[PDB]
Each structure stands twice: as C-alpha cells, then as structure tokens.
Coordinates of all heavy atoms in Angstrom, one line a residue:
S1 N 94.0 189.3 196.3 CA 94.2 190.3 195.2 C 95.4 191.2 195.6 O 95.5 191.5 196.8 CB 93.0 191.1 195.0 OG 91.9 190.3 194.5
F2 N 96.2 191.6 194.7 CA 97.3 192.4 195.0 C 97.8 193.3 193.8 O 97.4 193.0 192.6 CB 98.5 191.6 195.4 CG 99.0 190.6 194.4 CD1 100.1 190.8 193.7 CD2 98.3 189.4 194.2 CE1 100.6 189.9 192.7 CE2 98.7 188.4 193.3 CZ 99.9 188.7 192.5
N3 N 98.5 194.3 194.0 CA 99.1 195.2 193.0 C 100.5 194.9 192.9 O 101.3 195.0 193.8 CB 98.9 196.6 193.5 CG 99.5 197.7 192.6 OD1 99.6 198.8 193.0 ND2 99.9 197.3 191.4
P4 N 101.0 194.4 191.7 CA 102.4 194.1 191.5 C 103.3 195.3 191.4 O 104.5 195.1 191.4 CB 102.4 193.4 190.1 CG 101.0 192.9 190.0 CD 100.2 194.1 190.5
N5 N 102.7 196.5 191.3 CA 103.5 197.7 191.3 C 103.1 198.7 192.3 O 102.3 199.6 192.1 CB 103.3 198.3 189.9 CG 104.1 199.5 189.7 OD1 103.9 200.3 188.7 ND2 105.1 199.8 190.6
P6 N 103.7 198.5 193.5 CA 103.4 199.3 194.7 C 103.7 200.8 194.6 O 103.1 201.6 195.3 CB 104.4 198.8 195.7 CG 104.7 197.5 195.3 CD 104.8 197.6 193.8
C7 N 104.5 201.2 193.6 CA 104.7 202.7 193.4 C 103.6 203.3 192.7 O 103.6 204.6 192.7 CB 106.0 202.9 192.5 SG 107.4 202.0 193.0
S8 N 102.8 202.6 192.0 CA 101.8 203.2 191.1 C 100.4 202.5 191.1 O 100.1 201.7 192.0 CB 102.4 203.3 189.7 OG 101.8 204.3 189.0
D9 N 99.7 202.6 190.0 CA 98.4 202.0 189.9 C 98.2 201.2 188.6 O 97.0 201.1 188.2 CB 97.3 203.1 189.9 CG 97.5 204.2 188.8 OD1 98.4 204.0 187.9 OD2 96.8 205.2 188.8
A10 N 99.2 200.7 188.0 CA 99.1 199.8 186.9 C 100.4 199.0 186.7 O 101.4 199.3 187.3 CB 99.0 200.7 185.6
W11 N 100.3 197.9 186.0 CA 101.4 197.0 185.8 C 101.3 196.4 184.4 O 100.4 196.9 183.7 CB 101.3 195.8 186.9 CG 100.1 195.1 186.8 CD1 98.9 195.4 187.5 CD2 99.8 193.8 186.2 NE1 97.9 194.5 187.2 CE2 98.4 193.5 186.4 CE3 100.5 193.0 185.4 CZ2 97.8 192.4 185.9 CZ3 99.9 191.8 184.9 CH2 98.6 191.6 185.1
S12 N 102.1 195.5 184.0 CA 102.0 194.9 182.7 C 102.9 193.6 182.7 O 103.8 193.5 183.6 CB 102.5 195.8 181.6 OG 103.9 196.0 181.7
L13 N 102.7 192.7 181.8 CA 103.5 191.5 181.8 C 104.9 191.8 181.5 O 105.8 191.2 182.2 CB 102.9 190.5 180.8 CG 103.5 189.1 180.8 CD1 103.2 188.5 182.2 CD2 102.9 188.3 179.8
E14 N 105.3 192.7 180.6 CA 106.7 193.0 180.4 C 107.4 193.5 181.7 O 108.5 193.1 182.0 CB 106.9 194.0 179.4 CG 107.0 193.5 178.0 CD 108.3 192.7 177.7 OE1 109.3 193.0 178.4 OE2 108.3 191.9 176.8
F15 N 106.6 194.3 182.4 CA 107.1 194.9 183.7 C 107.4 193.8 184.7 O 108.4 193.8 185.4 CB 106.1 195.9 184.2 CG 106.4 196.4 185.6 CD1 107.2 197.5 185.8 CD2 105.8 195.7 186.7 CE1 107.4 197.9 187.1 CE2 106.0 196.2 187.9 CZ 106.8 197.3 188.1
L16 N 106.5 192.8 184.7 CA 106.6 191.7 185.6 C 107.9 190.8 185.3 O 108.6 190.4 186.2 CB 105.4 190.8 185.6 CG 104.4 190.9 186.7 CD1 104.4 192.2 187.3 CD2 103.1 190.5 186.3
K17 N 108.1 190.6 184.0 CA 109.2 189.8 183.6 C 110.6 190.5 183.8 O 111.5 189.9 184.3 CB 109.2 189.6 182.1 CG 108.1 188.6 181.6 CD 108.1 188.5 180.1 CE 107.0 187.7 179.6 NZ 107.1 187.5 178.1
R18 N 110.7 191.7 183.3 CA 112.0 192.5 183.4 C 112.3 193.0 184.7 O 113.4 193.5 185.0 CB 112.0 193.5 182.3 CG 111.7 192.8 181.0 CD 111.8 193.7 179.8 NE 113.0 193.4 179.0 CZ 112.9 193.0 177.8 NH1 111.7 192.8 177.2 NH2 114.0 192.8 177.1
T19 N 111.3 192.9 185.6 CA 111.5 193.5 187.0 C 111.8 192.4 188.0 O 112.5 192.6 189.0 CB 110.2 194.2 187.3 OG1 110.5 195.6 187.3 CG2 109.5 193.7 188.5
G20 N 111.5 191.2 187.6 CA 111.8 190.0 188.5 C 110.7 189.7 189.5 O 111.0 189.0 190.5
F21 N 109.5 190.3 189.4 CA 108.5 190.0 190.4 C 108.4 188.6 190.7 O 108.3 187.8 189.8 CB 107.1 190.6 189.9 CG 106.2 190.8 191.0 CD1 106.1 192.1 191.6 CD2 105.4 189.8 191.5 CE1 105.2 192.3 192.7 CE2 104.6 190.0 192.6 CZ 104.5 191.2 193.2
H22 N 108.4 188.2 192.0 CA 108.5 186.9 192.4 C 107.3 186.3 193.2 O 106.7 187.0 193.9 CB 109.7 186.7 193.3 CG 110.4 185.4 193.2 ND1 110.3 184.4 194.1 CD2 111.1 184.8 192.2 CE1 110.9 183.3 193.8 NE2 111.4 183.6 192.5
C23 N 107.1 185.0 193.0 CA 106.1 184.3 193.7 C 106.6 183.0 194.3 O 107.2 182.2 193.6 CB 104.9 183.9 192.8 SG 103.6 183.0 193.6
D24 N 106.4 182.8 195.6 CA 106.8 181.6 196.3 C 105.6 180.9 197.0 O 104.8 181.6 197.6 CB 107.8 181.9 197.5 CG 109.1 182.3 197.0 OD1 109.9 181.4 196.6 OD2 109.4 183.5 197.0
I25 N 105.4 179.6 196.8 CA 104.4 178.9 197.4 C 105.1 177.9 198.2 O 105.8 177.0 197.7 CB 103.5 178.2 196.4 CG1 102.9 179.2 195.4 CG2 102.4 177.4 197.1 CD1 102.0 178.7 194.4
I26 N 105.0 178.0 199.5 CA 105.7 177.1 200.4 C 104.8 176.5 201.4 O 103.6 176.9 201.5 CB 106.8 177.8 201.2 CG1 106.2 178.7 202.2 CG2 107.7 178.6 200.3 CD1 107.1 179.2 203.3
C27 N 105.2 175.4 202.0 CA 104.4 174.7 203.0 C 105.1 175.1 204.3 O 106.2 174.8 204.6 CB 104.6 173.2 202.8 SG 104.1 172.3 204.2
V28 N 104.3 175.9 205.2 CA 104.9 176.4 206.4 C 104.9 175.3 207.5 O 105.8 175.3 208.4 CB 104.1 177.6 207.0 CG1 104.7 178.1 208.2 CG2 104.0 178.7 205.9
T29 N 103.9 174.4 207.5 CA 103.8 173.3 208.4 C 103.4 172.1 207.6 O 102.5 172.2 206.8 CB 102.8 173.6 209.5 OG1 103.3 174.5 210.4 CG2 102.3 172.4 210.2
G30 N 104.0 171.0 207.9 CA 103.7 169.7 207.2 C 102.3 169.1 207.5 O 101.7 169.7 208.4
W31 N 102.0 168.0 206.9 CA 100.7 167.3 207.2 C 100.6 166.9 208.6 O 101.6 166.4 209.2 CB 100.7 166.1 206.3 CG 100.5 166.3 204.9 CD1 101.5 166.2 203.9 CD2 99.3 166.7 204.2 NE1 101.0 166.5 202.7 CE2 99.7 166.8 202.8 CE3 98.0 166.9 204.6 CZ2 98.7 167.1 201.8 CZ3 97.1 167.2 203.6 CH2 97.5 167.3 202.2
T32 N 99.5 167.0 209.3 CA 99.3 166.6 210.7 C 99.2 165.0 210.6 O 99.6 164.3 211.5 CB 98.1 167.1 211.3 OG1 98.2 168.5 211.5 CG2 97.9 166.5 212.7
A33 N 98.5 164.6 209.5 CA 98.2 163.2 209.3 C 98.4 163.1 207.8 O 97.7 163.9 207.1 CB 96.9 162.8 209.7
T34 N 99.2 162.2 207.2 CA 99.3 162.1 205.8 C 98.1 161.6 205.0 O 97.5 160.6 205.5 CB 100.6 161.4 205.3 OG1 100.5 160.0 205.8 CG2 101.9 162.0 206.0
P35 N 97.8 162.2 203.9 CA 96.7 161.7 203.1 C 97.0 160.4 202.5 O 98.1 159.9 202.5 CB 96.6 162.7 201.9 CG 97.5 163.8 202.4 CD 98.6 163.2 203.2
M36 N 95.9 159.8 201.9 CA 96.0 158.5 201.3 C 96.9 158.6 200.1 O 97.7 157.7 199.8 CB 94.6 158.1 200.9 CG 94.2 156.7 201.2 SD 94.3 156.5 202.9 CE 94.5 154.7 202.9
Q37 N 96.7 159.6 199.3 CA 97.4 159.8 198.1 C 98.0 161.2 198.0 O 97.9 162.0 198.9 CB 96.4 159.7 197.0 CG 96.8 158.8 195.9 CD 97.0 157.3 196.3 OE1 98.1 156.8 196.2 NE2 96.0 156.7 196.9
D38 N 98.7 161.5 196.9 CA 99.3 162.8 196.7 C 98.2 163.8 196.4 O 97.2 163.5 195.9 CB 100.3 162.8 195.6 CG 101.6 162.2 196.0 OD1 102.0 162.2 197.2 OD2 102.4 161.8 195.0
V39 N 98.5 165.1 196.8 CA 97.5 166.1 196.6 C 97.9 167.1 195.6 O 99.1 167.1 195.1 CB 97.2 166.8 198.0 CG1 96.1 167.8 197.9 CG2 96.8 165.7 199.0
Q40 N 97.0 168.0 195.1 CA 97.3 169.0 194.2 C 96.5 170.2 194.4 O 95.3 170.1 194.7 CB 97.0 168.5 192.8 CG 97.2 169.5 191.7 CD 96.9 168.9 190.4 OE1 95.8 168.7 190.0 NE2 98.0 168.6 189.6

C-alpha cells in the first residue's frame, strides 16, 4: 500500500496522469530453473 502524493493526504486519477506518477515492474534476478511454460 502506498500514497501517490507524498506531500499530502489525498490523490486523484487526474493528478496521477498529469503528474507522471510512474510504475516499473522489473525482474531483478532471472529464473534459477526455467518453468515448463510461460508465466503470468
């Protein structure tokens, strides 16, 4: 859980859009052993 607006106590979708709030989902370390199939 997180607050998208660190300066205050409320946020909004317009604020998120026009502000450029970002989200990155990365893989820090690859598979130790590869799965049989692709994952999701």
Side-chain angles (χ1 to χ4, degrees):
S1 293
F2 61 101
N3 175 190
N5 183 191
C7 312
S8 204
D9 58 4
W11 56 280
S12 72
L13 191 61
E14 272 290 333
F15 171 88
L16 254 33
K17 292 179 184 180
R18 307 185 111 116
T19 249
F21 200 96
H22 214 254
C23 178
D24 287 281
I25 299 182
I26 71 164
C27 162
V28 184
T29 281
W31 293 102
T32 295
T34 63
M36 226 57 206
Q37 229 62 240
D38 280 337
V39 183
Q40 180 177 75

